[PDB]
Every structure is written in C-alpha cells, then in structure tokens.
Amino acid sequence: RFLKVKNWETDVVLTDTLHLKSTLETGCTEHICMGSIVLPTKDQLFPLAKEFLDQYYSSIKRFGSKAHMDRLEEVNKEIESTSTYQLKDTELIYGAKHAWRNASRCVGRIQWSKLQVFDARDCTTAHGMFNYICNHVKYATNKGNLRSAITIFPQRTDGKHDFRVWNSQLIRYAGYKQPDGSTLGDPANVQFTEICIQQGWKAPRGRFDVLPLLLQANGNDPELFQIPPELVLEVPIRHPKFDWFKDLGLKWYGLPAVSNMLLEIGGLEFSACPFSGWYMGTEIGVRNYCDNSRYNILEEVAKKMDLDMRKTSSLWKDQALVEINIAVLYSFQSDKVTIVDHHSATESFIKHMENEYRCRGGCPADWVWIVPPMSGSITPVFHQEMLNYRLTPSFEYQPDPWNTHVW
Amino acid sequence: RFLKVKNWETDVVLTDTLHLKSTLETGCTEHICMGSIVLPVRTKDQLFPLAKEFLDQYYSSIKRFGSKAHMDRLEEVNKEIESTSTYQLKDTELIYGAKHAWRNASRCVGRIQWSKLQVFDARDCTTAHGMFNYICNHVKYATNKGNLRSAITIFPQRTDGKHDFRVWNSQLIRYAGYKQPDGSTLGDPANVQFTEICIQQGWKAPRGRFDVLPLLLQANGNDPELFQIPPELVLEVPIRHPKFDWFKDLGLKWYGLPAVSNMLLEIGGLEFSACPFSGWYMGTEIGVRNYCDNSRYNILEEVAKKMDLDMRKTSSLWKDQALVEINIAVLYSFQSDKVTIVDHHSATESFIKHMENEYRCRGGCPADWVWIVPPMSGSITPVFHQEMLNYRLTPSFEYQPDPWNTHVWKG
Numbered sequence A: 001r002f003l004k005v006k007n008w009e010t011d012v013v014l015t016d017t018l019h020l021k022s023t024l025e026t027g028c029t030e031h032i033c034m035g036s037i038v039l040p041t042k043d044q045l046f047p048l049a050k051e052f053l054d055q056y057y058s059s060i061k062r063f064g065s066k067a068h069m070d071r072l073e074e075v076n077k078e079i080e081s082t083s084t085y086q087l088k089d090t091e092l093i094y095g096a097k098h099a100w101r102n103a104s105r106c107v108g109r110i111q112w113s114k115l116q117v118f119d120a121r122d123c124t125t126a127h128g129m130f131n132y133i134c135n136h137v138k139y140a141t142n143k144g145n146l147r148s149a150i151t152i153f154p155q156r157t158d159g160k161h162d163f164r165v166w167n168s169q170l171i172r173y174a175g176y177k178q179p180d181g182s183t184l185g186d187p188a189n190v191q192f193t194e195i196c197i198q199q200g201w202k203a204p205r206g207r208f209d210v211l212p213l214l215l216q217a218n219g220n221d222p223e224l225f226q227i228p229p230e231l232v233l234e235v236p237i238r239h240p241k242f243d244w245f246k247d248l249g250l251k252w253y254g255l256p257a258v259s260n261m262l263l264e265i266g267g268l269e270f271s272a273c274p275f276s277g278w279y280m281g282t283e284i285g286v287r288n289y290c291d292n293s294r295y296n297i298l299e300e301v302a303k304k305m306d307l308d309m310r311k312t313s314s315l316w317k318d319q320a321l322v323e324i325n326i327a328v329l330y331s332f333q334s335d336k337v338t339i340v341d342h343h344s345a346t347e348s349f350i351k352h353m354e355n356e357y358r359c360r361g362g363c364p365a366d367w368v369w370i371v372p373p374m375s376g377s378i379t380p381v382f383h384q385e386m387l388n389y390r391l392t393p394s395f396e397y398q399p400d401p402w403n404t405h406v407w
Numbered sequence B: 001r002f003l004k005v006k007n008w009e010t011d012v013v014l015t016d017t018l019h020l021k022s023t024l025e026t027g028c029t030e031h032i033c034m035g036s037i038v039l040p041v042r043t044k045d046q047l048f049p050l051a052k053e054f055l056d057q058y059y060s061s062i063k064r065f066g067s068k069a070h071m072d073r074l075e076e077v078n079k080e081i082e083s084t085s086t087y088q089l090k091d092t093e094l095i096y097g098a099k100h101a102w103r104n105a106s107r108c109v110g111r112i113q114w115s116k117l118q119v120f121d122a123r124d125c126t127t128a129h130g131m132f133n134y135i136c137n138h139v140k141y142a143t144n145k146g147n148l149r150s151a152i153t154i155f156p157q158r159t160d161g162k163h164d165f166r167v168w169n170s171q172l173i174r175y176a177g178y179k180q181p182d183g184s185t186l187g188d189p190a191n192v193q194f195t196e197i198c199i200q201q202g203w204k205a206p207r208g209r210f211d212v213l214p215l216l217l218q219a220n221g222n223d224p225e226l227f228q229i230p231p232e233l234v235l236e237v238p239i240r241h242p243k244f245d246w247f248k249d250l251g252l253k254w255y256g257l258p259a260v261s262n263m264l265l266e267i268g269g270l271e272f273s274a275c276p277f278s279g280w281y282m283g284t285e286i287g288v289r290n291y292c293d294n295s296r297y298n299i300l301e302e303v304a305k306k307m308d309l310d311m312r313k314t315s316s317l318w319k320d321q322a323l324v325e326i327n328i329a330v331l332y333s334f335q336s337d338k339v340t341i342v343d344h345h346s347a348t349e350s351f352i353k354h355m356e357n358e359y360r361c362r363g364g365c366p367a368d369w370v371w372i373v374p375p376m377s378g379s380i381t382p383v384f385h386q387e388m389l390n391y392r393l394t395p396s397f398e399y400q401p402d403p404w405n406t407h408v409w410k411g
C-alpha cells in the first residue's frame, strides 16, 4: 500500500503515498498489464465537487474552515437547485493547473504551476471561440518566446450543448490523398482535412498548409475560421553543417497546442479547453518527420547523406535520425523559438519527479510516454521506475466530434 | 473474453485470447500500473494441480490430450507426489518445458527462435566440479566458433530448498569490476559486488579492464566453488569502427556469448534454480547499455571527444551522435569476425512477425513493451508502434534472489 520506485542508474528509491488518492481505473488488472495501450447526476456530482473542494481548500491551508464549509454548503445547494455548479475563478485556475500536474504522460510538467489560464466561460458563439483562440495563439507564441497557456470554454450541461474544437491541435498541416496513390502533407490529418473540405474549406493542396479551425459552440454545427497567418509562427528547417538540407523543403510550426481533450474539474467537464506549451525537439524530428505514417523522410535524407542503405546494420536510419533532429533544434534555436531537446527535458522531469515525491508524496507517470522516441537509455528517465495512476483534475481523451455530432 | 491490440503504424488489430490462461500476478491493479517496475520448499498440497496443468498442456501440444498415455502419466505423477512429495519430468517434458519458458518470456525480443533451443539435461550432476564440466560444454557448443547456437543447461530441481544448485554468476561470461580507493571503477561497474565475492572466495584478480570472471558454482546446497573457464573457450571480439581508425585504440572488446545464469526455471511446479541459457547478442545490448549506460563502461564522452563533437550544448545531440557510431562499430566488429549478432532493426521486425504468428497460432503473445523497445532509436523500430499485452504464463523464467543473500554457509 506504500509503494516504492527505484532509479537503476542512481540507486535512489522514492516512496509513493499519492496513489492512494487515485480514483479512475488504469485498464490493468492482476492478470494483465495494459501499460502500452494508447486508449484503455447530482448524487454522482456532489461527492466529486467535495473531493475537489476538499483538496482546493486543503491546498490553501484552510481545510475544515468556515469558508471551506460555506463553499461546500454553497455548492451543495447549487447542485441540488441547478443540477450543476459554477467554479470560482480561483478554483478554475487551480483545477486547470492540477490537470496538467496530473497528466502522467507529460514530460514537461516541471512547468505546471506557470500555466496562464484564460477564462472563456462567457463565450457563446464560434466567432467568439475564434477570437479567444487567436488571442491564445498570439499570447502563447509571444514572438517566439513561448508561454504555456490554456483557454477554457463553457462546461458541459446536458451534453447537447457541448463546446468542441474539432481540430486535434490549434495548428496542424493538412493532409491530402493523391490520385497517384501517395499522400501529400500530413497523413495523420487526412480525415480531418476531408471534413474541412466537406464543410467548405478551399484547400491550397500544398504540403504545409495550415489547417482552418472548426469551432463548435453550444452544441451547434461547427464553423470554419482561418487563423491570421501572421499569428502562426513557423521555422524553416536547416542543418548547421549540411548545406543541402534546406532544399528538402521542410518547416514546422512553433506552437504545440492540444485542442481535442476533455478537462475534468470537480465533476464538471470542459470539452473545449485548448492548451499549449512548447515543443520537445524529438516530437518534430523523430515522430513528425520520421514516423512511417507521417512525413516519413528518412529515406530521402539518408540518400542525401550518401549512406549505405543496403543493410539495416549500417544503422543509416539511426545516423540520419540524429541529423534530422540536430537540424530541428538548430533551426528553432537560430530563430529564437523556444524548444527543448530530449536530454534537457528528461533531466528536468527527474528533478520535478523528486520534487513531487518530496512535497506531494508522489507523481503519476507513464514510462512508455515519458521515455523519448530516440536515444531512450541515454536519458535519465529510462532508468527511472515510474508508477502510473489516475488523479483528478485531469485531461481525458474524448471521442472525435464527427462520430458524436447530430447535425 | 477477447482483448484487442492495435499497431498505430499499420492499423493492424490483433485479438488476444491466450491471456485467459494467465494464472500468476502482474503487479498491476485497477488503480495502479507497475509496468515500468523491474522486480514487481513447496507442499504437495499445491503441487499436483500445477503438475496437472503442465501435463495437460504438454499432452495437448503433442496431440494426445486425454489419451491413456496422458491419463497414466497424471496417475504416475500423482502417486510419485504422494509417495515422495515431488516428481521427475521425462526428457520430453523437460525439453518442452524449457522451450515454453523461453516462449513465454514476455521481456525477450528474440523469441522467434524459441523452438530452436538446445536442451542440455544436467539433472544427473552432483558436484560443483560436475557443474563446471557441464557449463564448459554448454559454452563450447553454443559458441560454435562464432556461429552461435541457443542452448540451456538444466541442473537438478529444488527439493527442500536447502539443497539448491545455483550458478552464482548473473551471466556465464562477464567482465570483472573493481572499485578503486579513489572512487573510480576499473572494468564493468555492474559486476563490482560479484567480483569482490570471487576475490574473497580466493580468485586471483589480474585487475584489468576486461578480466573474464571465474565461475562460482553451488551444488546440492553446498558452499560455492571457483572455476576458471578455459580462455580458449571464451570467444571475444575486438571493437573497431569501419570509418574511424582511432576507434580500435579505445581498447574495447566484448565477449560473443550472452548467457543468463541467475534465473529460475519453473516447469509444472518444479523449480530449477540453476539453468543457464544463451542465445546471441542484439547490437544495442553492448553498444547502448554495456558501453553507454553511465553506470557501466560509460565511453560516450571519450568517443565524442575523438569525433570532435560540440560537447558544450546537449542540443548538439553529441551524445546521440556518438552513440550511433559506437553501435555501428559493435555490429561492424562482430560481422567482420563472423560472430553471430543482430541489429535492433532486424530483431524488432523479426519479433513483430513472430508476435503476429503467435496471435494467429496461439491466440496471443505476452510482451513487455518497456523491455521489447530498443534503448536507442525507439520509434524507428516497428515495436514502438505496437500495442502489447503483458501477462504471465508457465512454464516461465523467474527472478530469484541472489544466493549470497540467502545461502546458509556450511563454512
């Protein structure tokens, strides 16, 4: 019941007491571990509110105080009367930050307390949502000096008035399937690109076309909006030693901004809560550029370096992968766009992890996601045993809107 | 029940039914996943059901389930258990058992080869000297002048737990590690503790960077004894780089035969506490872990210096860059000396094919993702994108505590 994690590089052991407060399920059982699986009413509501308020009021050193009791009382009344309740600004900010804090798959959580929170709960329309999102993008981008932020739109009511952002990220490149059989642009974004076109987007059918926003307010039909181009910061990709790299035509956007998750706080559900931080280098160089089901550019890069691609044992893929990733970090750094390499980030997480164990009694973490997709064992997290478990407030996955939406 | 795994690169979906035959625990609960945790004397009471479970499986595999031979064998084991409190496996059952433990080893990427396992029956062995001889033959046979053959040697099963056979070495062949008074380490830092024991047990350490450790062998619960593997039997490969001529001057080499000797083999409730096994190396085990772990030989700095990489910013990826060339050198070296080795690309792709075949023919293939994914270049190998289900089947290889923490010294 009091669990221990070992670092096999430093022999350091930590004791986890925090997991006892876990509520949601993992997917795993005593008979089977699903650690590598990507996706495993009023009576319901008040205990949820109370659990949340109890930790809010405990966090502000006023547990069991009049203001505490009063709030509980007050929220209990409002749930009884309204079948829901509204979070106070203070609670909203706490909840959002703690959702990030609890995100067991996120390596960048050392930053958790510095989340800029934008209360968009007064928003009523998609144009409204658009205005709020452009403001988010511009604030967070900050001319390349990125700042973490989240914008929170009205909470769910009866599930038929949901606010949803249909894009998976605020900024992503379109994907087009060619009559020639291949795929132009980002293959991960093909299906969404079709919905855009089906909703009226006129695609430029280029390779790096910034997608339009599909915004949905109050459970209404989603609307299309183009982000002001001058608000979308992009970085041309060059290599510091290889002159020819620039001719590969590669660029990436500076702002990673997840927009399809569900934020849960005290039983309330925020279905539209786009948040953003800044890139770890490998997300772009390893995953986005080198995944077979993405831009898949390894072969072309390798050819340009003139490597022996005859046998896998020349490790030409590995060589090219390093250089591709060198170029990304180099390109961003040269243009003063905030980026972090996988070494620096993982080292930060180990410090954060220790901090959490020391001050909170633990830190839920998913090793499968925390370990970077390249050079894993030369990063400290690889040798770090982690306990994975679900704490609330949380960001959750939710079904894509098109399967849900009654047009 | 039915469970589905998805490959996020190819969208191939597979269905696991085999996990239903899982008995043992994972360490996980509905409230906690322990998937990245490294480590999460028996009565006749529990023994026969375990025996029966195994024998039922064995007889099904040979298509004789419910036969008279099946029924007689269960009867025979039942009686041997009540008369003698244990039982002996037939040769056929031992071989089947040993292959299936490998097959069930959810952390092993090399399981495509599982049916091709050379089983050496050392159950007649009675002394440490006898163990030495058996192990020498294993090493020679498995090395095969560089054309490596998987083998396992099985010593007598546990009885009352006071007469265990144990190989005290974690691996048959390993390099000594010596802590210096200045805090530095000569040799393999992983093996410092064991080296000290060996020295204490009478080993004359030559104290170099690559000294092959003596065998420390325990027979029938007696004190362990030292033996030195004949040098001529220990195949080693000098490490050089195909393009970089200075790489040879780093003075590196490794041994060709990876051979785990500190694990426990469970077959039908029987415990084999001494069961060394060997296959051949995946390049990254040496090039990434053995050379590049900070707690091991830790050569990244010295290599990157010789390459003249920018070592001021970690964002130059100088560590990643040196790590690749080192792994290039390990593969090049082994191939050049005609010693069996496999690269992580080849090995993971082979595993994926193996895993799919197992779903089709067996209804599942338990796999530990954390261990299956190579320690470099993870997502450019197909396993990274493979959802896997981890569960425990028997026969199995289990961890057991180090013998020096348990052994009652006869003295």
Ligand code: HEM
Residues within 6 Å of the ligand: A100, A103, A105, A106, A107, A108, A109, A111, A115, A148, A149, A150, A275, A276, A277, A278, A279, A280, A283, A340, A345, A369, A395
């Ligand atoms: C500021 C620097 C940040 C860094 C370096 C960072 C890094 C990462 C990385 C590498 C991943 C793995 C995702 C992938 O490979 O696709 C991830 C996941 C995640 N991050 Fe962070 N992130 C940052 C900011 C944030 C912020 C501001 C939030 C929330 C307010 C957040 C919440 C999450 C969540 C919920 C996931 C899991 C997403 C999923 O499961 O699909 N991150 N992060």
Ligand code: HEM
Residues within 6 Å of the ligand: B098, B102, B105, B107, B108, B109, B110, B111, B113, B117, B150, B151, B152, B277, B278, B279, B280, B281, B282, B285, B342, B347, B371, B397
């Ligand atoms: C023939 C070529 C083989 C290859 C390429 C291979 C590959 C590997 C690798 C890379 C590991 C991870 C080791 C580490 O990173 O610490 C591993 C683990 C393991 N292997 Fe294999 N293996 C082979 C043969 C065998 C054989 C013959 C057996 C048994 C008869 C076996 C049983 C196991 C077991 C039980 C583990 C888990 C070790 C642990 O839990 O500490 N392997 N294998």
Ligand SMILES: Cc1cc(N)nc(CCc2cncc(CCCN(C)C)c2)c1
Residues within 6 Å of the ligand: A038, A108, A256, A257, A258, A275, A276, A277, A278, A279, A280, A283
């Ligand atoms: C805020 C933030 C910061 C950062 N450095 N990276 C991210 C990336 C998060 C992210 C990007 N693409 C995709 C996913 C999820 C893909 C897999 N889903 C289906 C589980 C998540 C987000």
Ligand SMILES: Cc1cc(N)nc(CCc2cncc(CCCN(C)C)c2)c1
Residues within 6 Å of the ligand: B038, B039, B110, B258, B259, B260, B277, B278, B279, B280, B281, B282, B285
């Ligand atoms: C038969 C075999 C073949 C092969 N290619 N590799 C191996 C390596 C197995 C191996 C080697 N060192 C260390 C470990 C992990 C040890 C267990 N934990 C507790 C440190 C595992 C074994």
Ligand SMILES: C[C@H](O)[C@H](O)[C@H]1CNc2nc(N)[nH]c(=O)c2N1
Residues within 6 Å of the ligand: A036, A037, A038, A368, A369, A370, B008, B384, B385, B386, B387, B388
């Ligand atoms: C199948 C496996 O779970 C899948 O490839 C996961 C592995 N780890 C990951 N880790 C991160 N950070 N991001 C990912 O998308 C994935 N994908």
Ligand SMILES: C[C@H](O)[C@H](O)[C@H]1CNc2nc(N)[nH]c(=O)c2N1
Residues within 6 Å of the ligand: A008, A382, A383, A384, A385, A386, B036, B037, B038, B370, B371, B372
């Ligand atoms: C804590 C973590 O599980 C530990 O460092 C593991 C990670 N995955 C591994 N995978 C392999 N093949 N070998 C290892 O030693 C480890 N170590």
Ligand SMILES: [Zn+2]
Residues within 6 Å of the ligand: A028, A029, A032, A033, A034, A035, B028, B032, B033, B034, B035
């Ligand atoms: Zn688990």
